[PDB]
Symmetry: C4
Subunit: 93 residues, 4 copies
Amino acid sequence: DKEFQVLFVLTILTLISGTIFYSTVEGLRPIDALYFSVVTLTTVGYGEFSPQTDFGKIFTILYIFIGIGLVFGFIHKLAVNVQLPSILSNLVP
Amino acid sequence: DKEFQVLFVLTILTLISGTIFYSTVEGLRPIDALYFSVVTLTTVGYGEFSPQTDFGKIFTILYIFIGIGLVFGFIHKLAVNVQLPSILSNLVP
Amino acid sequence: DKEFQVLFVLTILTLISGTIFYSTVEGLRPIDALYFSVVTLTTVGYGEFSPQTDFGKIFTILYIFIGIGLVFGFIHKLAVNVQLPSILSNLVP
Amino acid sequence: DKEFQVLFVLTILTLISGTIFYSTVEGLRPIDALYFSVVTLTTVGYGEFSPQTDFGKIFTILYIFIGIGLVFGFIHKLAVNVQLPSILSNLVP
Ligand SMILES: [K+]
Ligand SMILES: [K+]
Ligand SMILES: [K+]
Ligand SMILES: [K+]
């Protein structure tokens, strides 16, 4: 549960970093920057927003490599250590 | 096999939730909303439909984090506990 | 190595099925249909081609759920049982 | 740590190959070709750049199958053998 908290905070900080970057460099609204960061790191990739600048493209490359591991790490812990036990508890009437 | 049934039902409910949300908030046809929900949670992300409203964007963020774990959990069980044995059984003439 | 061969053939058959479906229902050139099938099941999802018909959308939903498991199963075996040993062998001068 | 170095170099070479291919065949700027290669192999798939030629489509199919395993292998090692210990070390004041 300390592992979950840590992954939770790391995920938030990572996404705040993306939000700051894309709003600054690609000129997105903060909400759009946050959304883009999430859709990128979860690898959903809508692409409706996609970096138009080389700085944006280079950062996105680095961001994916460093960020995917921590985002999926958090999702995996969320699924196995949080959602799994919760659904199980519901199954005992 | 009770695990498969549970993951099956959770996946259906999750997708129904997405269908309801996107048809309501983003104004998609139910079929398009369902399709969008699936393409989002499996992380395929065509993006032909992509949320235009901030409510849509914020929900999609939360939906991905909560939904990916249960959708891939179902796919993984479907693959290992259902498809794997089926193909194996076919390989004995 | 029989496991690799089986996953290889299952992957080919799965992709041929997608090729047939999308060329028929969505009217894509066979090459475009094959490409779409691959980009869908590997979850890359360019979306340049994305189903315009409801039949196309419903099939794509089912196709993803049934196909992702077998495609990633093949990729995983290709990586661990084929590429891994190959690169290792190269590392001994 | 020799495993990390090897996966690091293999990832670089794989991406250089993609950069060369897409700039040549699809006529992309090298930076755009590199970006496309990364967004493809990590399966993010923005699709803003998507192959217009059949040669491009066929290569992309083969590239995904051969490349995904080595890119995610590198990401996984980066996450578990590099990022994991680093964050842990930060947690001891
Ligand atoms: K993906
Ligand atoms: K994707
Ligand atoms: K995508
Ligand atoms: K896309």
